[PDB]
Amino acid sequence: MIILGYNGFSQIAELFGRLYGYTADSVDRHSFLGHDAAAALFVDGELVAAVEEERMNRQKKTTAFPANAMRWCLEQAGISYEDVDYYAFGWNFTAEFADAAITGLASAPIPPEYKFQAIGSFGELWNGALGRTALIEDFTRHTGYALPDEKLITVPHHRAHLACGRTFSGLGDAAFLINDGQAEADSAIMGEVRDGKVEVFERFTIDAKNSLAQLFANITRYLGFTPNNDEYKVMGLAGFGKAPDEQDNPLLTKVVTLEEGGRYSLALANDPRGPRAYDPLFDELFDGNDDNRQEFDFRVRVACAAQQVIEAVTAHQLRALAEATELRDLIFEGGLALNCVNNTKLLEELPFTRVEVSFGASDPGVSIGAAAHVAREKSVALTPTESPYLGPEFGEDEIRATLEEYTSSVTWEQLPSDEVVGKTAELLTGKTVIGWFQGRTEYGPRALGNRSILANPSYADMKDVINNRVKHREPFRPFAPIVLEENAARVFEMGRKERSPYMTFVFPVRPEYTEKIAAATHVDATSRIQTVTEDSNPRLAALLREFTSRTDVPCLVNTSFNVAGEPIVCSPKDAVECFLGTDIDHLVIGDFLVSKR
Ligand SMILES: NC(=O)OP(=O)(O)OC[C@H]1O[C@@H](n2cnc3c(N)ncnc32)[C@H](O)[C@@H]1O
Ligand SMILES: [Mg+2]
């Protein structure tokens, strides 16, 4: 039983650019489905391989067919397209949905002129990208394998999110919340998993016009940031501000309405100007004009408001789900689980003992999920696994061959394998920013110490220094720390958590370490931490013991290894080209210590 799950449409790029004006140069360029195209391959229940097409084609959140990733996934498992039993697509645009979607459109309080325009666009998206026919054509043009209808199973988007979380959570019977920007028809659902069987409580299912995630997205656009690429900047800005009273939160009274059964709805959900309608309504709530919106204290006030909406709405949803079932082990998946601040708050302030958000809570995870969903259904007992390190590895010979292609630009020494960790630790004792390239490429949006820039957080000026050594760093972004699992409770206020290996939860820094791990903390006194063990990342675990024995510092800064708007480096080619395009001191890539000439 070989099952491959994927996500992408080659024509989705073209169609949104034309129909909705969402073009490659627009701030709305990441705001259409198919973003975070990828492949994930299960052989006999072991998740053998996975990587996002953004890492291969080097184009961020690429909506493309994941051709290079599917190539690589098959190569890793040493098979071809024809050995795969079922392909899993992480969207389920069936005829039944399209039947309901038109029927829905027909039945709506709208001038029929807007109705023709909408139904016709949905047609262009249907025929162009979404439909089972477009899919089979799209696959067949790109792989060269002609995909038998038999071998293609489309998974409901939200169900694909669910399948990702279950694969990595460790749990059995669990409650769950999926809350993403938009699915086929829903924007969020809740239910439970009991003794293998998923059950959606349809009573909580929120429609796509009442989208909590896309409200935050509109807010991100409002403040001159890229919606669907820069929402953390809002979360980030909520750090420098005080939350209003919930009765004093303009967005929580004139935009969002809390309904019984943990439901909610939005003013201007049915306005046929689309979502851009909220732009002037936001000016009418926050003094907004053309010399105040992209300002700081403005950005901060809004941010706090938006962040509180997020905290407020999701809190309601989960309260409801509390009575709806007995279970207190929660799976939170979908893109609103990217709000790591909010994730901690749900855990601590609500009745769920355990809350598991995976490194694939976002759409990148729906490629893994799509495959997992089909497998479990095929009674294929799934080998439990916690590892995000699912992408391309590189040998000692492939790195040495790449560094020789750059003899003119960099020098390098090849250290003995088990001395590297200790030599990098000695460097890291200084005001030194490091490139760290080891093991298989990590999956999802956060770098978890295989394609990382590392640095010593103990020096007070290190924040300013990292941002200066790696020019081309994207602003409004705080630095996150790595720590060994054992030092987590000592250094951070963990509450109900004993470990956070994916940077999915934020935690307050205890006062006795605030000067020691400064660079890896926000002004909120918060760190989006990655716990590390000899089991999860032995080389990374080892680095920390060497670094900590020398400095008595328990944490290293771990920030994504990339320039602005470029995705995380995948190849060693990628790593060196980045190292040279930055003022980073050194690059430790496998057993090699690269320096510049
Ligand atoms: N399925 C689909 O359409 O893609 P998806 O599941 O990846 O959507 C993620 C959604 O979460 C929003 N989002 C991203 N980061 C966020 C954060 N920190 N807080 C709140 N919303 C966030 C983001 O703007 C987007 O609306
Ligand atoms: Mg999604």
**Residue 184 beta carbon below 6 angstroms from any ligand 1 atom:** no
Which strand (E) or helix (H) includes residue 548? Answer: helix 538-551
Calculate helix-pair angle for 296-324, 278-286, nearest 10 degrees: 110
What three-state secondary structure class fits 260? Answer: coil
Beta strands in 10-96 (DSSP E): 38-43, 46-52, 86-89
What is the rounded CA–CA span in Å between residue 378 and residue 68? Answer: 27
Which residues surround the ion ligand 2 when the cut-off is CB under 5 Å? 180, 363
435: Cα separation from own chain's centroid:
22
Give whole-number Cα distances, 350 to 242, 312, 328, 347, in Å: 21, 12, 10, 6
Taking alpha carbons only, the member of 407, 412, 439 closest to residue 423 is: 412
Give the DSSP per-residue string, 113-171: HHHHHHHHHHHHHIIIIISHHHHHHHHHHHTSS---GGGEEE--HHHHHHHHHHHHH--
161 labelled as ligand-binding? yes
- 3-state secondary structure labels for all residues of 449-461: CCEEEEECCCCCC
- Active-site residue flag, 35: yes
Chain breaks in the chain (C to N over 2.5 A) after: none
Judge contact between 267 and 333, C-beta under 8 A: no
Catalytic residue among 30, 35, 373, 522: 35
What is the rounded CA–CA span in Å between residue 394 and residue 571? Answer: 8
Taking alpha carbons only, the member of 290, 294, 305, 125 closest to residue 215 is: 305
User: In this structure, what are the phi and psi dihedrals at residue 473, rounded to the nearest 5 degrees?
Assistant: -90, 140
Contacts of 149 (CB under 8 A, 6+ apart): 132, 136
CA of 445 to the centre of ligand 1 (A): 12
Q: Is the dihedral of CA 404, 410, 411, 417 positive or negative?
A: negative
User: In this structure, what are the phi and psi dihedrals at residue 373, rounded to the nearest 5 degrees?
Assistant: -55, -55
What is the rounded CA–CA span in Å between residue 420 and residue 441? Answer: 19
CATH number at residue 510: 3.90.870.20
What is the rounded CA–CA span in Å between residue 213 and residue 208? Answer: 10
Q: Residue 453: give the domain boundaries.
A: 391-596
Nearest atom in ligand 1 to the alpha carbon of residue 342 is: 19
What is the rounded CA–CA span in Å between residue 576 and residue 221? Answer: 34
Out of 228, 345, 504, 524, mutate this one to test ligand 1's pocket (max ligand atoms within 8 Å of CB): namely 228
Q: How was this structure determined?
A: X-ray
Taking alpha carbons only, the member of 460, 462, 409, 397 closest to residue 434 is: 462
